[PDB]
Amino acid sequence: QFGRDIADTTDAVRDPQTLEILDITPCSFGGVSVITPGTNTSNQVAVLYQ
Amino acid sequence: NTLVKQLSSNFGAISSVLNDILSRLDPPEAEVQIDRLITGRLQSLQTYVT
């Protein structure tokens, strides 16, 4: 009825209506960072998603 | 690897997965149960950094 990954987590599931196996992937997660020239110089900044 | 396996430990809480508790129990009972998992998880995290 279920699958589980080696991270102990429920990776996949059987649909009760269609008995079709479905794989889950979490909502996208992102690492965020900010770059600056130094406040005593300029305020334009660039952003980086890791 | 050890740190990921530590997510499955229940620390004497009702269940390993918080969503099980936070579904089946109302706030004033969950809030004395989820309180334990946090203490158990933090201490496993603290050890890793050290």
């Binding site: 991270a7 987590t9 979490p26 997660f29 690492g31 890791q50 | 740190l3 990921v4 997510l7």
Partner: peptide
């Protein structure tokens, strides 16, 4: 293709979670 040296390219091959907030 890599400028890696002949001994270095021999050397490399002797050697060999994101959902949980672990990252590299």
């Amino acid at each position: 293709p890599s400028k890696r040296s002949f001994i270095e390219d021999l050397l490399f091959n002797k050697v060999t979670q994101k959902f949980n907030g672990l990252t590299v």
